[PDB]
Design an enzyme around this catalytic site. Structure first.
Site, short mmCIF file in Angstrom:
data_model
loop_
_atom_site.label_atom_id
_atom_site.label_comp_id
_atom_site.label_asym_id
_atom_site.label_seq_id
_atom_site.Cartn_x
_atom_site.Cartn_y
_atom_site.Cartn_z
N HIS A 72 0.82 -1.23 0.00
CA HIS A 72 0.00 0.00 0.00
C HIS A 72 0.84 1.26 0.00
N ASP B 139 11.33 22.32 -24.34
CA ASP B 139 11.21 20.99 -23.72
C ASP B 139 12.10 20.95 -22.48
N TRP C 269 7.04 -0.53 4.93
CA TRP C 269 7.69 0.19 3.85
C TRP C 269 9.13 0.64 4.16
N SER D 41 15.16 6.25 -11.52
CA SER D 41 14.19 7.07 -12.27
C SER D 41 14.16 8.50 -11.70
N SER D 42 14.00 8.58 -10.38
CA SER D 42 13.89 9.92 -9.73
C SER D 42 15.21 10.72 -9.69
N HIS E 278 12.89 11.09 5.85
CA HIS E 278 12.34 12.40 6.17
C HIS E 278 12.31 13.36 4.92
N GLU F 164 12.08 12.51 2.01
CA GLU F 164 11.09 11.92 1.11
C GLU F 164 9.70 12.58 1.40
N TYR G 278 9.04 15.55 2.45
CA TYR G 278 9.04 16.86 1.89
C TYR G 278 8.99 16.88 0.40
N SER H 159 -0.29 27.07 -4.32
CA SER H 159 -0.08 28.51 -4.49
C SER H 159 -0.70 28.96 -5.80
N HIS I 201 13.79 11.81 14.45
CA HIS I 201 12.49 11.82 15.11
C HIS I 201 11.68 10.55 14.76
N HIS I 202 12.18 9.76 13.79
CA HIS I 202 11.67 8.42 13.50
C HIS I 202 12.24 7.32 14.40
N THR J 142 6.77 26.73 7.41
CA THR J 142 5.52 26.13 6.91
C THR J 142 4.33 27.09 7.22
N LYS K 219 3.95 29.85 4.75
CA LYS K 219 3.20 29.49 3.56
C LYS K 219 1.67 29.48 3.84
N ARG L 68 0.64 0.01 15.48
CA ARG L 68 0.71 -0.07 14.05
C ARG L 68 0.99 -1.52 13.62
C1 HEA Z 1 3.54 14.63 3.16
C2 HEA Z 1 3.95 13.95 4.17
C3 HEA Z 1 4.40 14.41 5.52
C4 HEA Z 1 4.70 15.70 5.94
C5 HEA Z 1 4.71 16.90 5.08
C6 HEA Z 1 5.06 15.53 7.27
C7 HEA Z 1 5.38 16.67 8.11
C8 HEA Z 1 5.71 16.63 9.42
N1 HEA Z 1 5.83 15.53 10.13
FE1 HEA Z 1 5.50 13.59 9.57
N2 HEA Z 1 5.22 11.63 8.97
C9 HEA Z 1 4.87 11.24 7.72
C10 HEA Z 1 4.50 12.13 6.65
C11 HEA Z 1 4.63 13.57 6.61
N3 HEA Z 1 4.93 14.25 7.78
C12 HEA Z 1 4.86 9.81 7.61
C13 HEA Z 1 4.58 9.07 6.33
C14 HEA Z 1 5.29 9.35 8.77
C15 HEA Z 1 5.50 7.94 9.21
C16 HEA Z 1 6.75 7.24 8.65
C17 HEA Z 1 6.58 5.78 9.09
O1 HEA Z 1 6.92 5.44 10.26
O2 HEA Z 1 6.08 4.98 8.23
C18 HEA Z 1 5.50 10.51 9.62
C19 HEA Z 1 6.03 10.47 10.94
C20 HEA Z 1 6.40 11.65 11.72
C21 HEA Z 1 7.09 11.55 12.92
C22 HEA Z 1 7.51 10.28 13.63
C23 HEA Z 1 6.57 9.79 14.69
C24 HEA Z 1 6.74 8.34 15.11
O3 HEA Z 1 6.97 7.46 14.23
O4 HEA Z 1 6.66 8.05 16.33
C25 HEA Z 1 7.26 12.85 13.39
C26 HEA Z 1 8.01 13.16 14.64
O5 HEA Z 1 8.46 14.33 14.79
C27 HEA Z 1 6.72 13.64 12.35
C28 HEA Z 1 6.60 15.08 12.38
C29 HEA Z 1 6.25 15.94 11.32
C30 HEA Z 1 6.40 17.35 11.42
C31 HEA Z 1 6.79 18.13 12.67
C32 HEA Z 1 6.08 17.78 10.19
C33 HEA Z 1 6.04 19.23 9.79
O6 HEA Z 1 6.60 19.40 8.48
C34 HEA Z 1 4.63 19.90 9.90
C35 HEA Z 1 4.73 21.44 9.80
C36 HEA Z 1 3.31 22.05 9.55
C37 HEA Z 1 2.60 22.64 10.52
C38 HEA Z 1 2.99 22.81 11.95
C39 HEA Z 1 1.28 23.22 10.12
C40 HEA Z 1 1.26 24.60 9.47
C41 HEA Z 1 1.77 25.66 10.41
C42 HEA Z 1 1.16 26.75 10.90
C43 HEA Z 1 -0.28 27.08 10.64
C44 HEA Z 1 2.01 27.71 11.76
C45 HEA Z 1 1.92 27.68 13.23
C46 HEA Z 1 2.26 26.40 13.89
C47 HEA Z 1 2.89 26.33 15.07
C48 HEA Z 1 3.42 27.44 15.96
C49 HEA Z 1 3.09 25.00 15.67
N4 HEA Z 1 6.14 12.96 11.30
C1 HEA Z 2 0.50 8.84 -0.38
C2 HEA Z 2 0.44 8.02 0.60
C3 HEA Z 2 -0.71 7.34 1.23
C4 HEA Z 2 -2.08 7.50 0.92
C5 HEA Z 2 -2.68 8.43 -0.11
C6 HEA Z 2 -2.75 6.59 1.75
C7 HEA Z 2 -4.18 6.46 1.72
C8 HEA Z 2 -4.89 5.56 2.52
N1 HEA Z 2 -4.35 4.84 3.45
FE1 HEA Z 2 -2.37 4.57 3.95
N2 HEA Z 2 -0.37 4.29 4.44
C9 HEA Z 2 0.65 4.98 3.92
C10 HEA Z 2 0.51 5.86 2.81
C11 HEA Z 2 -0.70 6.36 2.21
N3 HEA Z 2 -1.97 5.87 2.54
C12 HEA Z 2 1.93 4.58 4.47
C13 HEA Z 2 3.24 5.15 4.08
C14 HEA Z 2 1.62 3.70 5.47
C15 HEA Z 2 2.46 3.00 6.47
C16 HEA Z 2 2.98 1.63 5.88
C17 HEA Z 2 3.75 0.84 6.90
O1 HEA Z 2 3.28 0.77 8.10
O2 HEA Z 2 4.85 0.24 6.53
C18 HEA Z 2 0.19 3.57 5.42
C19 HEA Z 2 -0.50 2.79 6.38
C20 HEA Z 2 -1.96 2.78 6.40
C21 HEA Z 2 -2.68 2.18 7.41
C22 HEA Z 2 -2.13 1.48 8.62
C23 HEA Z 2 -1.79 -0.03 8.48
C24 HEA Z 2 -1.26 -0.53 9.77
O3 HEA Z 2 -0.53 0.17 10.58
O4 HEA Z 2 -1.59 -1.70 10.08
C25 HEA Z 2 -4.07 2.35 7.10
C26 HEA Z 2 -5.13 1.81 7.95
O5 HEA Z 2 -6.28 2.26 7.81
C27 HEA Z 2 -4.05 3.05 5.92
C28 HEA Z 2 -5.18 3.39 5.12
C29 HEA Z 2 -5.36 4.22 4.00
C30 HEA Z 2 -6.64 4.51 3.46
C31 HEA Z 2 -8.01 3.98 3.90
C32 HEA Z 2 -6.32 5.41 2.50
C33 HEA Z 2 -7.25 6.13 1.58
O6 HEA Z 2 -7.38 7.55 1.99
C34 HEA Z 2 -6.93 5.96 0.09
C35 HEA Z 2 -8.04 6.49 -0.80
C36 HEA Z 2 -7.74 6.89 -2.21
C37 HEA Z 2 -7.13 8.00 -2.55
C38 HEA Z 2 -6.72 9.02 -1.51
C39 HEA Z 2 -6.87 8.42 -3.97
C40 HEA Z 2 -5.94 7.57 -4.68
C41 HEA Z 2 -5.37 8.31 -5.88
C42 HEA Z 2 -5.68 8.19 -7.12
C43 HEA Z 2 -6.77 7.24 -7.51
C44 HEA Z 2 -4.98 8.91 -8.22
C45 HEA Z 2 -5.90 9.75 -9.08
C46 HEA Z 2 -5.06 10.29 -10.20
C47 HEA Z 2 -5.03 11.47 -10.77
C48 HEA Z 2 -5.85 12.60 -10.34
C49 HEA Z 2 -4.03 11.83 -11.85
N4 HEA Z 2 -2.76 3.30 5.43
O1 LIG Z 3 8.56 12.28 8.10
O2 LIG Z 3 7.61 13.22 8.91
CU LIG Z 4 10.22 12.65 9.44
#
Ligand code: HEA
Ligand code: HEA
Ligand SMILES: [O-][O-]
Ligand SMILES: [Cu+2]
Ligand SMILES: CCCCC/C=C\C/C=C\C/C=C\C/C=C\CCCC(=O)O[C@H](COC(=O)CCCCCCCCCCCCCCCCC)COP(=O)(O)OCCN
Ligand SMILES: CCCCCC/C=C\CCCCCCCCCC(=O)O[C@H](COC(=O)CCCCCCCCCCCCCCC)COP(=O)(O)OC[C@@H](O)CO
Ligand SMILES: CCCCCCCCCCOCCO[C@H]1O[C@H](CO)[C@@H](O)[C@H](O)[C@@H]1O
Ligand SMILES: CCCCCCCCCCOCCO[C@H]1O[C@H](CO)[C@@H](O)[C@H](O)[C@@H]1O
Ligand SMILES: CCCCCCCCCCOCCO[C@H]1O[C@H](CO)[C@@H](O)[C@H](O)[C@@H]1O
Ligand code: CUA
Ligand SMILES: [Mg+2]
Ligand code: NA
Ligand code: NA
Ligand SMILES: [Zn+2]
Lengths: 49, 91, 75, 44, 136, 55, 514, 70, 40, 72, 254, 102, 227
Positions: free
Chosen positions: G61, G91, G126, G156-157, G240, G242, G244, G255, G290-291, G316, G319, G438
């Site tokens: 997934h 291009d 993953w 690719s990337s 991490h 990734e 971003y 924007s 932080h992971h 952030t 923005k 999880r």
């Molecule tokens: C698009 C994906 C995405 C983004 C952008 C982020 C953004 C952030 N993530 Fe997250 N994160 C994930 C996807 C993402 N995360 C995933 C996939 C995991 C799990 C990986 C795994 O274990 O599989 C994860 C796990 C994860 C962890 C690990 C937790 C754990 O495993 O126990 C933490 C810990 O610090 C973290 C923090 C943050 C923070 C601080 C940001 C920051 O960038 C957020 C900043 C934004 C805001 C705060 C909001 C806007 C701000 C304002 C309106 C201003 C005012 C705010 C304040 C004064 C607070 N993320």
């Molecule tokens: C982009 C990343 C992403 C997205 C979108 C989602 C979407 C969803 N995910 Fe997630 N998920 C993860 C990334 C994502 N997930 C990751 C990284 C983990 C952790 C894996 C791990 O533990 O190792 C995870 C784990 C995770 C869990 C936890 C499993 C566990 O800990 O046991 C669950 C449980 O409910 C869940 C559910 C769902 C559901 C119901 C959605 C739904 O919201 C999905 C619904 C459909 C969509 C949001 C749209 C899909 C897009 C298209 C059809 C493209 C259309 C195309 C054009 C417009 C060009 N996901």
């Molecule tokens: O990676 O938040």
């Molecule tokens: Cu991180």
């Protein structure tokens, strides 16, 4: 010149709402889903040892 | 010893066209930014083209981050829709 | 002796080296004491600390390796 | 090359029903794939 | 696509071209008349001059619509449809849940949870009255 | 050796509509065919190995 | 002509189109997987089998949604289509290498599919941590196929990153400074820098895993003096950045969308938006641990990673406030794309803030490896990255196709998705706080109500996905050809019509230096 | 005759007032959480432990049969 | 954005067919497998 | 210029390589076979190698590389 | 066109390269698990064919067709720099692995570095010769570059020949060092970090020597001008990268 | 200041040979600002429309005045009152008088 | 343990988890402050017919848009880091216990004096006694003295696991070859449940942790009886 929404809007809105409610309540209450709600105020404890 | 060809001797195709036009102070392949005139109706920016229209971007004020884009057509000079500076196509 | 005291050489979550060092010190201490007809029972402090801290399978594996001639720690 | 609406794509939109069939095979094969792998695996 | 075009936008009240490009006989006559005093133009003529230049008025371009009803109603239809999938799932995919969900097991389990004082400060046992032997 | 770049420039600039990968002549077409045939045949073989390995 | 056009392309638009098709197909696979996860969890007990089949599904997934849906759609799809147009370039810099970045993805996806078809699949997460992912606890080909899948996606990337950075730096009009390029172009450039630096470190780590599995190396094996924690550092050094990479192009599209549907010629605070994306890109490399707050790191290390991670909120927030200030004073057009963008601003904020909760190492002790993390990341991915994708796709579909969508259908699509994603994930916060781990195929009985509701939300999301397919079909079925597009003066990508011709800017734009 | 109303800066004026309101509402809403939840929680723990008797709590649990060790 | 009228209008009936076929393409293959899990 | 870098190539670079070559060839020969001890952190075998009999490293040298069970 | 960029002819090489990647990886899998090298050999073969034709085509487009205008050349400069940067970060991971293991040796090792039972290579023996060899090759390639810029065919060729000979010498020396070493890749994390890091570096020596050989043959065929020779500059930048990586390995991992 | 801004805009619209491009650019620029333009600006714009023989644009200009006012329903009636002499003298009907407000 | 329809943390059993509950409330209030500010402002931006579409001066907000969020982060980080360092302060435990993770069960070792150890498996659902908890109960519980500081050392004999007990604020990864420490102190007797918190294969969902907290006398009695 009345549009799609002038003609069908209230009907789509009333029917959709009615269908959505009916079908979710039926799903929630009539098919044996166990929601496992809080026992608090609901369950009479019974001797276990 | 010599034995290594020069660009003069061996450059070809578009690289050669570019090199030769540069010696003559000409820019047929648009490597350089064109210098602005005062941009008035009397003294419009002359926009070369190989067809009957070309897109202009106008940076109205220096260090604007926004560029204003429009099609310039063959005919009467047109004006940037933001600052009014004049542009005239020369096909 | 109740349990292994806080040791400022090993202040962190990772306690690996605390177990390891005390296992080493027990055997180093016994060797040095037995060589000088000294009191070997002094070394008991180290045995108590490593027995408290070390997983049984780690102590057992290291003991086996010492018997085998394959223990990589210097004693 | 062909230019314009309906012409800059690797699939044809000449007929909306043939398009429907192609879109359904396309998306439906991607949706179905995990279910079929689950089947595959459970049958081992 | 490269030509100046018409838009109705309230922050661009005077667009780049007129709404009507090609004028009939009388429309050109009306334009000639617009060169003389406007008091001499009728209401109809004024409106017509307006509709040569512009497509919709401000009031028209700014009008409310009933689209929200179709969107909300249709969303609720589709959400309703989803519950049909869930019912189908419950009947044809899901088997029995574990025996620990039986009413008697829950009654027993609840007592044992109160006997071990699960969450006694706020969350669970806190809500049981140990003196009166009932829920608060 | 002698500088024969001018000859290769004439050859590769010949106005014959061929894409660059084939513009050397007959040898290009053969090397292309061998390459694409190994790639496609090998991809087929790889799907075969998957079928076998899946059971 | 079809093979020449679609298999041997050197055209940024057609390659963009291939990426959008691939990514839409991947999104269906990832949606099926999401439904399988939520079907397993939708009632107490065992549906599919034990945690091995369940985590095969979970792991796939994640890989599918990240590497085969989000990245190809944002960077391959919108990046290829839009970037050249937005700087008036003819291009990409390397239009042939660009085609290989595309064609590496179907084989990468075929490897991942193969991993799940052989043996018992890769039920690793993953993150692919050893020793579970090693050759004793995951004997056989599945994990190796997964590694190779990632190598191909990585190549690719990397190649795509080189192509975008070169294109964006070298192929602007000679009068245009970097600070006169649109924000989406910036977001793509910065994402490309992040990919270039981070994916090689992933490649090293997964290569070590491959050698531990097959060449008797012991990088991660205590018996040889290796350390499973080393793999975690290398993985998250990539992982991490990734996230971003996943959000930055979505910031860029937001924007654009907010600006356009507010009736504005420009986003508020352009320089601040550039500064903010560069800050986020930099800070994204110094926070990975932080992971790892429960692995047993030193206290000062934990303090540093807590602090550094929270700092990301500042740029952030700039923005978010700038998007609101773009709305300020707007002539607001409530288009479907505008709805996606407004939902993004709010829901991404919520997800960001639960990330800030998790940044606190002490609290993270109790939240780590629970559903609170799952709720955080799905708000930023399912309601952030995906909302930006949907917004961008509805907004630019007419440019790419030359046809309009039915706006009422698109609003209905938005409404259903909005309900579905919030119903799926909001209750996962409660499941996390109360201790649900999880990667579990089943849960203690207490957790039943929220799991039930969450699963119901996933089925609503399914309905939205199915409807989106229909909406795209209806647009191509009806063939409403574009007539006029407003605000072209500040949205260059539209100025060559809908769709633009195969070759655009054969004659480049004229921009003087004055 | 109608008097001249304010004609300039109307959007800016609305924002100057409403920003103050945004802050007040958002502070009020957050403070209500603190009051209804956090202050309630502080009091519930201080009250529970004020005269808490761990041995009595233990004896009651023991008597109900919950332990392996007693 | 403005657009020309549909070259090939899609009537309500035609949309009902497109929508049904779309939903069935997702729902039938998945439903088949889900129904038959036990058998596997 | 070229003249400087050619000077460096013939005056500093190649002579340095020649001296190191001379010194490696003279001081090559063949030294001690290390005594074998079956340490558990060496001669790791978690999976057979994909060549040979499964138990020989790729550049296995019978003179100085013992197998898990000792020298050949 | 009235810009200076290169619209590339539609090309099969991207697809053959992508399929070659599939065949190499599925082939490694079949080798590791099913004891068969056929798929892998076919992938290596298709990969080599793709590389040959693709780069053949870039020479056709530039030397023979004139498409490398200054703006195109400038883009290739950026692309090669960025490619090098990605390779540096790949190596960084192995350096990280090495330091992680060596600065905190675990109990299995004897809690010391080098581990108990490991007899490290002496860096003042063949590794010092290796170092002299790559440093000398950095001097020779610099002579080759200046000869090219000055228009001197013979000295370019002589310098470039020397540079290649030195890279081949390094590779032979490293193969011998691998055979003579008393420890192996399977000698725990010591062997792992040493062989994988130096092994990837040896791969890169091979790659860079190959790239220099391509340059040598192109120079023999008069492709390069005294002012336009980016294939040569790119090979020299890559070679300098190879040299710098060695110097870090020499200082760190020995 | 406000007065200096007003006087530049009056001066702009007053240019005797103002052309159609310039009239449109004037009005479209002006309605981007956070203000309803002063009667004397609108007066000058209306008279440009007259010199340019453009009755429709005069009506449109009155609509955009009302629009810019938003929920402040006192501003339009007021501007109309202030403009009545110019409306009467040039024969410019209001949108209301033309039914263009429905 | 967790209870049905629960919204927040399990009730605290240790002083440390009490601290974490307060710190979470403090941080969630800030979450609510910011998320409500944004929704209110969104809604404000979207509810007026008044317009201003010409260029806006962005430099006016530079300061408050970075300084006020910086100050709010400080208000989070200060208590966060206080708790971080408090939790790290010198532990003088009275007892050391080890746990080793296995596929799929935990073992425990109490080797301060005697070599006491045992395995702890999940009770299969078919074997639960009436009123016992599905997936949570074990055969042999981790018996521990209440009101005492205890050092728990955690490792694994195979793959990663993670040893967690939410109600005591504990979660420590179980990494083969490494010995990770945490400290545990219960304010109360009772039964406190946790579950393996690192994906570890087939039965990850099925290897729980049950602590049984009792007066020292009963811990000593049980100790001697399990030898
Ligand atoms: C698009 C994906 C995405 C983004 C952008 C982020 C953004 C952030 N993530 Fe997250 N994160 C994930 C996807 C993402 N995360 C995933 C996939 C995991 C799990 C990986 C795994 O274990 O599989 C994860 C796990 C994860 C962890 C690990 C937790 C754990 O495993 O126990 C933490 C810990 O610090 C973290 C923090 C943050 C923070 C601080 C940001 C920051 O960038 C957020 C900043 C934004 C805001 C705060 C909001 C806007 C701000 C304002 C309106 C201003 C005012 C705010 C304040 C004064 C607070 N993320
Ligand atoms: C982009 C990343 C992403 C997205 C979108 C989602 C979407 C969803 N995910 Fe997630 N998920 C993860 C990334 C994502 N997930 C990751 C990284 C983990 C952790 C894996 C791990 O533990 O190792 C995870 C784990 C995770 C869990 C936890 C499993 C566990 O800990 O046991 C669950 C449980 O409910 C869940 C559910 C769902 C559901 C119901 C959605 C739904 O919201 C999905 C619904 C459909 C969509 C949001 C749209 C899909 C897009 C298209 C059809 C493209 C259309 C195309 C054009 C417009 C060009 N996901
Ligand atoms: O990676 O938040
Ligand atoms: Cu991180
Ligand atoms: C070649 C370079 C690196 C490949 C990995 C390992 C080789 C290390 C160098 C080397 O050749 O090491 C040798 C082992 O070779 C061996 O295992 C040889 C193993 C040969 C098979 C290699 C398997 C392929 C590796 C996959 C590469 C991944 C590429 C990823 C690119 C990333 C894209 C983003 C050492 O010999 P030995 O007998 O153990 O000890 C010496 C005793 N006298
Ligand atoms: C390996 C061999 C590379 C051969 C490249 C040959 C093509 C070449 O060098 O092409 C040059 C362009 O550079 C270019 O594309 C540069 C592109 C080449 C980069 C190759 C780098 C190595 C890739 C190896 C893969 C690494 C795998 C490592 C695993 C981790 C052609 O331009 P010039 O040289 O200026 O000539 C034109 C003049 O004649 C005009 O007067
Ligand atoms: C591109 C991604 C495609 C992803 C496809 C995912 C579908 C995955 C199904 C995985 O099947 C795993 C094998 O599971 C079966 O065998 C396992 C081991 O014997 C058992 O532990 C399980 O209970 C299950 O019966
Ligand atoms: C991505 C592409 C990577 C390509 C990897 C290529 C690796 C090719 C390895 C070929 O190795 C063959 C095995 O050679 C080993 O075993 C043989 C005995 O079986 C010996 O004769 C060899 O001297 C060597 O020790
Ligand atoms: C720069 C890094 C060094 C990489 C150099 C690789 C090129 C050298 C390849 C030589 O490979 C063979 C190793 O072969 C030697 O040992 C093998 C095992 O005992 C034998 O089968 C062979 O007959 C040979 O004696
Ligand atoms: Cu043990 Cu998860
Ligand atoms: Mg974990
Ligand atoms: Na389940
Ligand atoms: Na040069
Ligand atoms: Zn301008």
């Amino acid at each position: 010149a009345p549009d799609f929404h002038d003609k069908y809007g209230n009907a789509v809105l009333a029917s959709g709402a009615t269908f959505c409610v009916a079908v979710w309540v039926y799903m929630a209450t009539q098919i044996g889903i166990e929601w496992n709600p809080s026992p608090v105020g609901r369950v009479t404890p019974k001797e276990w040892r | 010893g010599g034995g290594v060809p020069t660009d003069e001797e061996q450059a070809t195709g578009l690289e050669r066209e570019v090199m030769l036009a540069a010696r003559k102070g000409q820019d047929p392949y648009n490597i350089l930014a064109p210098k602005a005139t005062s941009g008035t109706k009397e003294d419009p920016n002359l926009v070369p083209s190989i067809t009957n229209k070309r897109i202009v971007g106008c940076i109205c004020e220096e260090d604007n981050s926004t560029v204003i884009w429009f099609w310039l057509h063959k005919g009467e000079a047109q004006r940037c829709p933001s600052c009014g500076t004049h542009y005239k196509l020369v096909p | 002796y109740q349990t292994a005291p806080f040791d400022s050489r090993f202040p962190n979550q990772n306690q690996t080296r605390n177990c390891w060092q005390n296992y080493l010190d027990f055997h180093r201490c016994e060797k040095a004491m037995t060589a000088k007809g000294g009191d070997v029972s002094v070394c008991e402090w180290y045995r108590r600390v490593y027995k408290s801290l070390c997983p049984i399978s780690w102590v057992s594996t290291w003991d086996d390796r010492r018997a085998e001639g394959t223990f990589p720690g210097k004693i | 090359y062909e230019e314009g609406p309906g012409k800059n794509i690797p699939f044809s939109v000449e007929n909306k029903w043939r398009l429907l069939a192609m879109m359904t095979l396309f998306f439906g094969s991607g949706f179905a794939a995990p279910f079929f792998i689950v089947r595959h695996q459970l049958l081992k | 696509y490269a030509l100046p075009s018409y838009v109705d936008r309230r922050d661009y009240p005077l667009p780049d071209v007129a709404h009507v490009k090609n004028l009939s006989a009388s429309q050109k006559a009306l334009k000639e008349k617009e060169k003389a005093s406007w008091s001499s133009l009728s209401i109809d003529e004024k409106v017509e001059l307006y509709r040569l230049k512009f497509k919709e008025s401000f009031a028209e371009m700014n009008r409310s619509t009933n689209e929200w009803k179709t969107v909300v109603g249709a969303a609720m239809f589709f959400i309703g449809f989803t519950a049909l999938l869930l019912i189908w799932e419950k009947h044809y995919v899901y088997g029995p849940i574990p025996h620990t969900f039986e009413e008697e097991w829950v009654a027993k389990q609840t007592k044992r949870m109160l006997d071990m004082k699960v969450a006694p400060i706020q969350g669970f046992s806190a809500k049981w009255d140990y003196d009166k032997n009932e829920w608060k | 050796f002698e500088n024969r770049v001018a000859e290769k420039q004439k050859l590769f600039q010949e106005d014959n509509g061929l894409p660059v990968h084939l513009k050397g002549g007959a040898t290009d077409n053969i090397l292309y065919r061998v390459t694409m045939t190994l790639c496609l045949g090998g991809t087929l073989y790889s799907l075969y190995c998957l079928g076998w390995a899946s059971f | 002509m079809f093979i020449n056009r679609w298999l041997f392309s050197t055209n940024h638009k057609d390659i963009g189109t291939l990426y959008l098709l691939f990514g839409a197909w991947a999104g269906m696979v990832g949606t099926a997987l999401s439904l399988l996860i939520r079907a397993e969890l939708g009632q107490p007990g065992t549906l599919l089998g034990d945690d091995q089949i369940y985590n095969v599904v979970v792991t796939a997934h994640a890989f599918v949604m990240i590497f085969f849906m989000v990245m190809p759609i944002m960077i391959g799809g919108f990046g290829n289509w839009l970037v050249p147009l937005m700087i008036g370039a003819p291009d990409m810099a390397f239009p042939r290498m660009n085609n290989m970045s595309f064609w590496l993805l179907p084989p990468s996806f075929l490897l991942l599919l193969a991993s799940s078809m052989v043996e018992a699949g890769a039920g690793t997460g993953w993150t692919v941590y050893p020793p579970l992912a090693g050759n004793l606890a995951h004997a056989g080909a599945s994990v190796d196929l997964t590694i190779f899948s990632l190598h191909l996606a990585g190549v690719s990337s990397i190649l795509g990153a080189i192509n975008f950075i070169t294109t964006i730096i070298n192929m602007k009009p000679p009068a245009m400074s970097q600070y006169q390029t649109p924000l989406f172009v910036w977001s793509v450039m910065i994402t490309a820098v992040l990919l270039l630096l981070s994916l090689p470190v992933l490649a090293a780590g997964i290569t070590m895993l491959l050698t531990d599995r097959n060449l008797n190396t012991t990088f991660f094996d205590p018996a040889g003096g290796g350390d499973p924690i080393l793999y975690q550092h290398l993985f998250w050094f990539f992982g991490h950045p990734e996230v971003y990479i996943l959000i930055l192009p979505g910031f860029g599209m937001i924007s654009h969308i907010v600006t356009y549907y507010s009736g504005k010629k420009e986003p508020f605070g352009y320089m601040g938006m550039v500064w903010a994306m560069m800050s986020i890109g930099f800070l994204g490399f110094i926070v990975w641990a932080h992971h790892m707050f429960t692995v047993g790191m030193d206290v000062d290390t934990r303090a540093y990673f807590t602090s550094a991670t929270m700092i990301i909120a500042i740029p952030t927030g700039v923005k978010v406030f700038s998007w609101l200030a773009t709305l300020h004073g707007g002539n607001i057009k409530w288009s479907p794309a505008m709805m996606w963008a407004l939902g993004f601003i709010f829901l991404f904020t919520v997800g960001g803030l639960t990330g800030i909760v998790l940044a606190n190492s002490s609290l993270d002790i109790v939240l780590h490896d629970t559903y609170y993390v799952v709720a955080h990341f799905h708000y930023v991915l399912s309601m952030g990255a995906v909302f930006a994708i949907m917004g961008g796709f509805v907004h630019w579909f007419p440019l790419f196709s030359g046809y309009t969508l039915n706006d009422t259908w698109a609003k209905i699509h938005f409404a259903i998705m909005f309900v579905g994603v919030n119903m799926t994930f909001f209750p996962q916060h409660f499941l996390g706080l109360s201790g649900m781990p999880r990667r579990y195929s089943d849960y203690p009985d207490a957790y039943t109500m929220w799991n039930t509701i969450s699963s119901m939300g996933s089925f609503i999301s399914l309905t939205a996905v199915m409807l989106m397919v229909f909406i795209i079909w209806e647009a191509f079925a009806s063939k409403r050809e574009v007539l006029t597009v407003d605000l072209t003066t500040t949205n260059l990508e539209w100025l060559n019509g809908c769709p633009p011709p195969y070759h655009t800017f054969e004659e480049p734009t004229y921009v003087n230096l004055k | 005759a109608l008097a001249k109303p304010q004609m300039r800066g109307l959007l800016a004026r609305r924002l100057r007032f409403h920003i103050v309101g945004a802050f007040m509402v958002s502070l009020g809403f957050a403070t209500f959480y603190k009051f209804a939840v956090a202050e309630k929680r502080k009091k519930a723990y201080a009250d529970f432990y004020r005269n808490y008797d761990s041995m009595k709590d233990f004896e009651e649990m023991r008597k109900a049969g919950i332990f392996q060790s007693a | 954005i403005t657009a020309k009228p549909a070259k090939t209008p899609t009537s309500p009936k035609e949309q009902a067919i497109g929508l049904s076929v779309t939903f069935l393409s997702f729902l039938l293959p998945a439903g088949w497998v889900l129904y038959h899990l036990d058998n596997y | 210029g070229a003249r400087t870098w050619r000077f460096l190539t013939f005056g500093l670079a190649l002579p340095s390589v020649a001296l190191c070559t001379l010194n490696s060839w003279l001081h090559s020969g063949h030294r001690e076979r290390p005594a074998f001890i079956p340490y558990h952190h060496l001669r790791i075998r978690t999976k057979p190698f994909s060549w040979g009999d499964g138990n020989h490293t790729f550049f296995h040298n019978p003179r100085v590389n013992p197998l898990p069970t000792g020298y050949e | 066109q009235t810009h200076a960029y290169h619209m590339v002819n539609p090309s099969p090489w991207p697809l053959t390269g992508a399929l070659s990647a599939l065949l190499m990886t599925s082939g490694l899998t079949m080798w590791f698990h099913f004891n068969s090298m056929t798929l892998l050999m076919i992938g290596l073969t298709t990969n080599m064919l793709t590389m040959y034709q693709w780069w053949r085509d870039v020479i056709r487009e530039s030397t023979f067709q004139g498409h490398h205008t200054p703006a195109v050349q400038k883009g290739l400069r950026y692309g090669m720099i960025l490619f090098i940067i990605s390779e540096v970060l790949f190596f960084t991971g192995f350096f990280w692995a090495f330091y992680h293991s060596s600065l905190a040796p675990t109990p299995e090792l004897g809690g010391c570095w080098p581990p108990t039972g490991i007899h490290p290579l002496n860096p003042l023996e063949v590794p010092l010769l290796n170092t002299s060899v790559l440093l000398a090759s950095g001097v020779s390639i610099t002579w080759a570059h200046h000869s090219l810029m000055e228009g001197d065919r013979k000295h370019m060729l002589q310098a470039l020949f020397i540079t290649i000979t030195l890279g081949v010498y390094f590779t032979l020396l490293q193969a011998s060092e691998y055979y003579e070493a008393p420890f192996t890749i399977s000698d725990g994390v010591y062997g792992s970090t040493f062989f994988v890091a130096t092994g990837f570096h040896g791969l890169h020596v091979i790659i860079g020597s190959t790239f220099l050989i391509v340059c040598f043959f192109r120079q023999l065929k008069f492709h390069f001008t005294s002012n336009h020779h980016f294939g040569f500059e790119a090979a020299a930048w890559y070679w300098h990268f190879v040299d710098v990586v060695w110097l870090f390995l020499y200082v760190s991992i020995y | 200041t406000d007065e200096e801004f007003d006087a530049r805009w009056v001066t702009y619209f007053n240019k005797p040979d103002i052309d159609a491009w310039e009239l449109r650019k004037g009005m479209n620029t002006l309605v981007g600002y956070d203000l309803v333009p002063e009667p004397k600006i609108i007066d000058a714009a209306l008279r440009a429309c007259r010199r340019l023989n453009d009755f429709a644009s005069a009506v449109r200009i009155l609509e955009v005045v009302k629009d810019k006012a938003g929920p402040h329903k006192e501003i339009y009636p007021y501007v109309i009152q202030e403009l009545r002499p110019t409306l009467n003298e040039l024969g410019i009907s209001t949108p209301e008088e033309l039914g263009l407000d429905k | 343990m967790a209870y049905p329809m629960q919204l927040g943390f399990q009730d605290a059993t240790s002083p440390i988890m009490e601290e974490l509950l307060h710190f979470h409330d403090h941080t969630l209030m800030i979450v609510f402050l910011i998320s409500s500010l944004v929704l209110y402002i969104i809604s404000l931006m979207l509810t007026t017919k008044l317009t201003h579409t010409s260029t806006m001066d962005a430099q006016e907000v530079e300061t408050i848009w970075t300084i006020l969020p910086a100050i709010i982060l400080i208000l989070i980080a200060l208590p966060s880091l206080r708790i971080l360092y408090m939790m790290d302060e010198i532990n003088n435990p009275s007892l050391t216990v080890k746990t080793m993770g296995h596929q799929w069960y935990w073992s425990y070792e109490y080797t301060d004096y005697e070599d006491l150890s045992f395995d702890s498996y999940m009770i299969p659902t078919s074997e639960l006694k009436p009123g016992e908890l599905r997936l949570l109960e074990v055969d042999n519980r981790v018996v521990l003295p209440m009101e005492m500081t205890i050092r728990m050392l955690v490792s694994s004999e195979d793959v990663l696991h993670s040893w967690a007990v939410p109600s005591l604020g504990l979660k420590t990864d179980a990494i083969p070859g490494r010995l990770n420490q945490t400290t545990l102190m219960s304010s109360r007797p009772g039964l406190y449940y946790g579950q393996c918190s690192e994906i570890c294969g087939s039965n990850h969902s099925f290897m729980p942790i049950v602590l049984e907290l009792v007066p020292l006398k009963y811990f000593e009695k049980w100790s001697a009886s399990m030898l």
